[PDB]
Design a protein around this ligand. Sequence first.
Ligand SMILES: CCOP(=S)(OCC)Oc1ccc([S@@](C)=O)cc1
Ligand SMILES: CCOP(=S)(OCC)Oc1ccc([S@@](C)=O)cc1
Ligand SMILES: [Co+2]
Ligand SMILES: [Co+2]
Ligand SMILES: [Fe+2]
Ligand SMILES: [Fe+2]
Lengths: 314, 314
Amino acid sequence: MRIPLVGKDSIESKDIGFTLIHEHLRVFSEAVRQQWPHLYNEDEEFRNAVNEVKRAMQFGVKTIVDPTVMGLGRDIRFMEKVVKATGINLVAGTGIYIYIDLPFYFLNRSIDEIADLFIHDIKEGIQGTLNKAGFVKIAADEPGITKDVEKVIRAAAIANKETKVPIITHSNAHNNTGLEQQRILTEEGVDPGKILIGHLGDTDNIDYIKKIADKGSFIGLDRYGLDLFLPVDKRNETTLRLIKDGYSDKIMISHDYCCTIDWGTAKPEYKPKLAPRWSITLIFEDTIPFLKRNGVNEEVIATIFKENPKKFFS
Amino acid sequence: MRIPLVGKDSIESKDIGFTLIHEHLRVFSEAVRQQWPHLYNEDEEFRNAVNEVKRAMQFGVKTIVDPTVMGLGRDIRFMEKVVKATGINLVAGTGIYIYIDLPFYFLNRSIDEIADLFIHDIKEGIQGTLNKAGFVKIAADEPGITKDVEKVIRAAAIANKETKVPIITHSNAHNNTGLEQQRILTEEGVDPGKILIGHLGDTDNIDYIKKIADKGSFIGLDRYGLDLFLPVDKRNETTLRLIKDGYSDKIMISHDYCCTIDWGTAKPEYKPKLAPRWSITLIFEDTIPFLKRNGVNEEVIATIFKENPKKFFS
Ligand SMILES: CCOP(=S)(OCC)Oc1ccc([S@@](C)=O)cc1
Ligand SMILES: CCOP(=S)(OCC)Oc1ccc([S@@](C)=O)cc1
Ligand SMILES: [Co+2]
Ligand SMILES: [Co+2]
Ligand SMILES: [Fe+2]
Ligand SMILES: [Fe+2]
């Protein structure tokens, strides 16, 4: 069969249903959580993940793709507990989340032994369990394409050609990282249709977004609610204009919501100023309503949240 | 009383005895081990640690200060089990080990709350235990003193002024990165007598080593065996010229040995060409004899390995 699910039997990609392609049940810094655990409360972290999933499903969400990996505190056992209490289709991934340099472990190690880490997760299981990864997550940001970042990228390029699984990327919309991720992965033999260049919905600079979509890769309008990168309105006018231009087949929409996140910028007291209406159901309360009283039919909605996720994992 | 011990009552600085000031039982990258535990064998790690500590004790070593902190995989419980197995005096520390940037947890976080962590480990306990940290560890390398690195340094200073525990630093010998650590720490009100600037032993430039010592801080000739930083023989002449010029009042010696280390450079086949003689006992096999073989008497040896550590922690 097609797609691995956490705590469940793998599914035919055709049975994915309404999908949020980019959502985090919980993120934290492994290093920080290992050394200072007094800072965390996994009971509040569970109550939060459950409730945010329990809802969403009430809105008809069938599948959630969670791109929490190394650097973000992936926890297959925690994810597995959420599933028990909600019964959601959850897809976990492999990969490394860095902006500048890889952890020391990787000093003098090759691109391949990084790839073998991803491949291990996709074929054997993740973290001692038999739950396999469904995708590879890689990142790049303000610092640009460093030598270490380029390694994690080329490692993914190998994991894809090996396990066929798709590649999700985190990028900076204002600096070209997204185009570089696509540009490198493609030149390594990866099918553009298997790459989701992420966080492209942070810029209202459409000409750019289009070139990434014109080069065959899915465009991620995936941080709805985080006004600090770009407010809801300018995101909605950006999607819309793209759909109207006939790009609804590359468009993939999500929140990037973290039911719990230890990043300081995310202190439950910068919320009102940085990301006021940010949750895992904001597209149902704003985006979808907005897009339908604006000349976009249920068939296009189905293309974005159903057909596109399916194509991505097929 | 003063100095805290791992799995033991707190001793008085006078009971510290012969001490290896910089040695690691086990180091790994927290994120890597958490996500891919299949790369580690915690049975090998306990056997090597217990072994090396035993041999070091058979030479008369009574106490080992262990500067493994965040970024290097500080594991209090593992340490505590090594103490139970050998009977050693183990000094565990707190702090953050980074070259460039802090974990993502620290975005939009202040120096005070970074310091609050260190103080927590010192006054309350480590990783949920009653074992308390006896010192703070910081770092800087080729990257230099970055905005984030500086934060750790200044946070260390705050913890020091609040607890009185000393500070052990990691430094690059050929870039002044150590001189700056001293600058900043002392400027912030840290008694230079409470600082140990590490890895000065990697350079034969004695003028630089003297300047740091002259300014009232201990000098770390603490990587004996790591031929890739500096061969044993050239380290020997350097530590000799320093002792002859009367600097044993600030000289501290150790190996920075890691009974197990996940860095790709520490792969047991570079050993021959990188650090063949690198052990936790090399200085007994080569260094101490060499000194006697030459000028140094047994009164100087005591001060370097017994009195200096006693000052440091007093
Ligand atoms: C500058 C970082 O912005 P913040 S932490 O802002 C939260 C108010 O937004 C983010 C940042 C990272 C993520 S990822 C870890 O899911 C999700 C949201
Ligand atoms: C052996 C691991 O790396 P190398 S050969 O140096 C490569 C930077 O030596 C080191 C480097 C760093 C350390 S830290 C863990 O005290 C210990 C030994
Ligand atoms: Co991202
Ligand atoms: Co060091
Ligand atoms: Fe994300
Ligand atoms: Fe060290």
